[PDB]
Amino acid sequence: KVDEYGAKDYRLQMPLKDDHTSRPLWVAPDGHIFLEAFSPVYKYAQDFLVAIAEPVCRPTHVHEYKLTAYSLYAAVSVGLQTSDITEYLRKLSKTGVPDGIMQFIKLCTVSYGKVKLVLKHNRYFVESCHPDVIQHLLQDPVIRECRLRNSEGEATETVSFEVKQEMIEELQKRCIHLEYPLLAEYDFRNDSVNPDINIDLKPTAVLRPYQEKSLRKMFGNGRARSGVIVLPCGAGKSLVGVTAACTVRKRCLVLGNSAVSVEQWKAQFKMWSTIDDSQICRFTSDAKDKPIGCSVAISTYSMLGHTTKRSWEAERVMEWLKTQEWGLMILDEVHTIPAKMFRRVLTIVQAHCKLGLTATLVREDDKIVDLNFLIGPKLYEANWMELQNNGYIAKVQCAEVWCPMSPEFYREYVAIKTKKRILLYTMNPNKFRACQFLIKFHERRNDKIIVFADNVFALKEYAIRLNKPYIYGPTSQGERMQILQNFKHNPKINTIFISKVGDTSFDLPEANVLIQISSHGGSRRQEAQRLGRVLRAKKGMVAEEYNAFFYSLVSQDTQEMAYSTKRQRFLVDQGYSFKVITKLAGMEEEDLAFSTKEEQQQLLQKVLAATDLD
Amino acid sequence: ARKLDIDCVQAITGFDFHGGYSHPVTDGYIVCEEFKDVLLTAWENEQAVIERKEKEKKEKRALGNWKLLAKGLLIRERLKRRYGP
Amino acid sequence: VNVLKGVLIECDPAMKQFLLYLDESNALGKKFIIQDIDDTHVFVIAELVNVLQERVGELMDQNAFSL
Amino acid sequence: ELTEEQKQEIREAFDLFDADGTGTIDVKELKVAMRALGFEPKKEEIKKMISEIDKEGTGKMNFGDFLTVMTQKMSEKDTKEEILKAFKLFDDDETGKISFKNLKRVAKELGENLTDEELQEMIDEADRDGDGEVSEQEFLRIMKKTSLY
Numbered sequence: 001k002v003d004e005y006g007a008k009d010y011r012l013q014m015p016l017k018d019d020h021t022s023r024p025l026w027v028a029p030d031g032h033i034f035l036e037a038f039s040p041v042y043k044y045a046q047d048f049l050v051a052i053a054e055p056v057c058r059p060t061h062v063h064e065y066k067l068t069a070y071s072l073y074a075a076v077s078v079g080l081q082t083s084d085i086t087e088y089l090r091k092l093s094k095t096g097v098p099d100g101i102m103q104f105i106k107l108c109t110v111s112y113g114k115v116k117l118v119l120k121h122n123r124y125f126v127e128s129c130h131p132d133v134i135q136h137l138l139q140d141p142v143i144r145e146c147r148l149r150n151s152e153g154e155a156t157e158t159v160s161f162e163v164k165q166e167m168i169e170e171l172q173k174r175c176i177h178l179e180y181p182l183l184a185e186y187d188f189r190n191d192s193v194n195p196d197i198n199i200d201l202k203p204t205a206v207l208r209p210y211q212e213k214s215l216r217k218m219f220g221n222g223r224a225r226s227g228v229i230v231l232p233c234g235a236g237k238s239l240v241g242v243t244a245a246c247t248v249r250k251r252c253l254v255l256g257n258s259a260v261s262v263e264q265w266k267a268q269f270k271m272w273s274t275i276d277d278s279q280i281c282r283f284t285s286d287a288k289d290k291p292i293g294c295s296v297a298i299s300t301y302s303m304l305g306h307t308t309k310r311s312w313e314a315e316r317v318m319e320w321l322k323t324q325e326w327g328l329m330i331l332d333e334v335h336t337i338p339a340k341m342f343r344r345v346l347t348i349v350q351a352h353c354k355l356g357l358t359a360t361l362v363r364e365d366d367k368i369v370d371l372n373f374l375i376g377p378k379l380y381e382a383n384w385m386e387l388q389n390n391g392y393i394a395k396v397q398c399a400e401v402w403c404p405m406s407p408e409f410y411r412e413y414v415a416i417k418t419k420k421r422i423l424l425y426t427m428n429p430n431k432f433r434a435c436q437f438l439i440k441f442h443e444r445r446n447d448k449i450i451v452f453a454d455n456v457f458a459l460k461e462y463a464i465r466l467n468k469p470y471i472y473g474p475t476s477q478g479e480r481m482q483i484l485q486n487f488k489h490n491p492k493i494n495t496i497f498i499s500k501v502g503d504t505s506f507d508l509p510e511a512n513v514l515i516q517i518s519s520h521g522g523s524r525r526q527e528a529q530r531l532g533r534v535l536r537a538k539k540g541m542v543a544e545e546y547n548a549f550f551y552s553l554v555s556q557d558t559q560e561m562a563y564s565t566k567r568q569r570f571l572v573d574q575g576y577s578f579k580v581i582t583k584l585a586g587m588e589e590e591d592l593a594f595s596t597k598e599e600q601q602q603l604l605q606k607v608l609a610a611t612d613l614d
Numbered sequence: 615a616r617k618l619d620i621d622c623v624q625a626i627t628g629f630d631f632h633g634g635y636s637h638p639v640t641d642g643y644i645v646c647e648e649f650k651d652v653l654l655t656a657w658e659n660e661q662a663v664i665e666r667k668e669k670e671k672k673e674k675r676a677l678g679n680w681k682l683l684a685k686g687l688l689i690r691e692r693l694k695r696r697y698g699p
Numbered sequence: 700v701n702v703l704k705g706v707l708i709e710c711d712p713a714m715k716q717f718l719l720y721l722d723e724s725n726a727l728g729k730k731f732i733i734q735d736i737d738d739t740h741v742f743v744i745a746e747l748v749n750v751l752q753e754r755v756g757e758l759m760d761q762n763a764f765s766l
Numbered sequence: 767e768l769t770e771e772q773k774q775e776i777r778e779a780f781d782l783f784d785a786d787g788t789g790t791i792d793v794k795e796l797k798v799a800m801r802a803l804g805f806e807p808k809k810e811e812i813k814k815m816i817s818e819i820d821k822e823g824t825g826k827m828n829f830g831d832f833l834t835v836m837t838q839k840m841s842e843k844d845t846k847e848e849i850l851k852a853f854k855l856f857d858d859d860e861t862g863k864i865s866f867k868n869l870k871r872v873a874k875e876l877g878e879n880l881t882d883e884e885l886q887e888m889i890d891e892a893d894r895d896g897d898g899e900v901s902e903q904e905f906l907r908i909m910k911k912t913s914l915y
């Protein structure tokens with residue numbers, strides 16, 4: 001029922017009980033659950049809701065989580081039944097639990113853990129203790145096409161059956177339509193087909209409490225289970241992956257976006273894992289190692305997804321991989337998987353346990369529901385503000401700096417309606433002066449300055465005018481590494497311009513000042529990921545609540561405002577606040593570029609010279 | 615020769631140690647004399663195309679430079695018409 | 700003398716250029732932007748200023764987000 | 767949007783050659799028709815446009831064809847006027863030609879860093895008569911074959 005004010009009148013279906021202060025939870029029948037962080041029972045309720053509910057908003061006081069069938073299946077995979085969860089909700093719900101919510105839980109829980117998929121001898125078997133449901137599944141024509149049949153066309157016959165590998169993904173979508181999700185249970189200790197690997201954990205490795213908690217959530221009943229884990233950048237995600245690989249100790253495959261990530265993973269395994277270097281191989285197009293004896297492999301999506309003809313050695317590597325049975329596979333930046341080519345890689349590789357690690361999951365193409373069956377439910381996602389309080393991560397100080405557009409630029413901004421309009425507001429002379437002032441301020445403050453600019457031309461123009469290193473499309477790898485190492489150590493270099501390549505193509509040296517000038521157009525996940533990757537915990541400023549500094553230069557009254565607001569949606573959902581600043585104190589005293597009008601007019605000439613073709 | 619499907623083997627005439635390892639030194643390609651005259655005339659004609667393939671590519675660039683040049687003045691001209699005294 | 704009675708509008712110069720664009724493109728229709736007076740002030744006719752305010756409000760609506 | 771008052775001129779010109787009200791005018795009357803509305807075509811261009819309009823060999827065109835041709839000629843004429851103005855901007859010394867020195871000076875005016883060899887290459891490439899520079903006719907030709915305008 002809907003009130004005239006737009007609020008849904010839930011008073012009738014939520015009978016309140018007098019245990020107000022003791023019970024901290026509100027259970028709306030829409031599926032949303034509200035928790036008060038100031039309650040003395042916050043920690044227990046937080047831990048309980050993490051397993052059972054998907055977080056939505058985590059601000060300072062009132063947190064909102066959501067209930068999904070995927071969340072319920074994940075909780076079941078943890079090992080929690082319906083009765084205990086319902087009792088705990090009742091002991092914490094301020095009002096009566098709606099029956100429809102209760103009915104929804106009843107419907108989901110019963111159907112969980114019914115259908116199991118097992119990979120043995122390069123054959124996928126669907127089994128269940130209830131052949132009635134199994135026989136029912138035989139009715140589906142899509143299942144009939146997916147179910148492996150004889151070479152004569154005849155379908156094959158605790159009863160199970162082999163399934164076509166190339167038809168697995170379409171079957172997975174059908175399981176949701178059949179309301180019988182697959183059970184990704186792995187014989188963590190009962191495996192005998194795949195021999196172990198002499199890889200252990202070096203004593204220098206330390207698992208933070210949230211890291212160990214997430215690992216224990218993943219390893220239900222001591223058995224590895226495929227899933228998705230969300231860790232903020234700089235929280236030792238690579239350490240967590242190495243730890244999980246050492247724990248499973250079976251055949252381990254890792255996938256990264258670029259060869260730089262591959263090298264980072266190899267260094268991490270050398271830093272923490274006890275596996276011999278000879279058993280570590282990278283399937284890279286430049287550094288090639290034989291797949292033989294490669295206990296743990298690190299590769300990239302493009303190498304495996306190279307649909308065009310590859311090198312003959314690559315053919316041998318692919319054949320060895322297909323022959324090899326993978327107990328464990330590791331995927332990074334899971335938000336990239338929903339692409340068709342990278343999705344095909346999952347079909348290509350035969351792996352038992354597939355774990356995905358990433359910092360964000362808000363795909364602007366909303367291709368995440370199907371991702372729940374590509375890998376599994378989201379196992380864990382840490383509270384960023386909580387890690388800020390715990391000191392694990394730097395407490396970011398975020399600002400939105402409004403730079404008014406020059407009227408001549410603004411008149412031309414209105415004049416252009418096409419994609420060329422981007423260059424108009426991305427090249428604001430007032431924005432340039434503000435950036436110059438901020439750079440001077442932070443250099444006098446002796447801070448590492450990272451200037452993010454998606455537009456190549458704008459980035460090069462800014463860097464050349466300010467006489468600073470710039471990173472762009474080609475970015476020859478030797479020069480890139482040279483500039484990075486100069487930035488890390490040379491005190492003369494503390495201002496680096498990085499184009500869109502800085503998101504995932506390479507590791508970003510730790511900095512404290514991150515200035516964003518150019519936007520993708522609303523990539524709320526990409527820019528947030530890049531921000532989290534840029535800024536990490538810094539010693540010395542641990543006590544202060546603002547040890548990391550981020551500033552977004554936004555052109556006022558432009559379409560950049562809407563993009564910035566849409567982009568910061570996720571970060572606000574993460575509890576991060578953005579203060580709006582218009583007037584920058586100290587700019588008038590300092591002398592900056594484009595002080596005279598014709599200088600800005602000359603810049604306008606230069607930008608307009610770059611027409612729509614550029 | 616690959617276009618004409620004629621056997622073509624590089625003539626290894628020496629070996630160079632540059633780069634810390636001995637490396638093959640090749641002196642052209644040895645092709646059977648019977649096809650040699652047939653192979654030569656095409657090759658020159660092949661070159662007769664490739665050089666032209668170069669020239670056009672240069673001109674196609676140069677034409678754009680005109681579009682790059684004059685238009686750059688035009689806006690500079692147009693701006694002078696919109697803010698000139 | 701010929702002196703006109705209308706409405707004075709004071710805003711940021713960006714809005715001034717926006718009004719110039721509207722008059723030149725005739726998005727408002729008839730040329731109601733009779734005369735500019737200052738780099739931050741304009742002088743218009745009150746007959747169509749209300750609809751002009753609507754177009755101004757629409758622009759800032761575009762440079763915003765809906766929740 | 768093309769024209770509002772010049773279309774009346776084209777309609778009246780069509781009516782002048784269509785006093786009998788047949789709906790079409792003779793192609794041979796097109797030469798004077800261009801002269802009445804201000805166009806001054808050359809004989810070769812007259813032949814070229816007669817070939818395009820009269821591919822079917824009828825010799826008469828309706829008002830639509832005449833209006834389209836007049837609009838195209840007006841667009842070409844104003845484009846040629848703008849190209850002439852651009853040449854005069856190049857022709858700061860009023861020599862009628864864009865010599866290498868003129869091109870170099872006008873390029874340094876924009877601050878462009880195009881090499882002098884590239885400048886003379888551009889001069890020669892747009893040079894047709896081989897005089898060593900580019901003429902008004904050659905500049906018109908290079909503008910017609912330009913990327914767009």
Ligand SMILES: [Ca+2]
Pocket residue numbers: 856857858859860861862863864865868
């Ligand atoms: Ca001249």
Ligand SMILES: [Ca+2]
Pocket residue numbers: 893894895896897899900901904
């Ligand atoms: Ca000439």
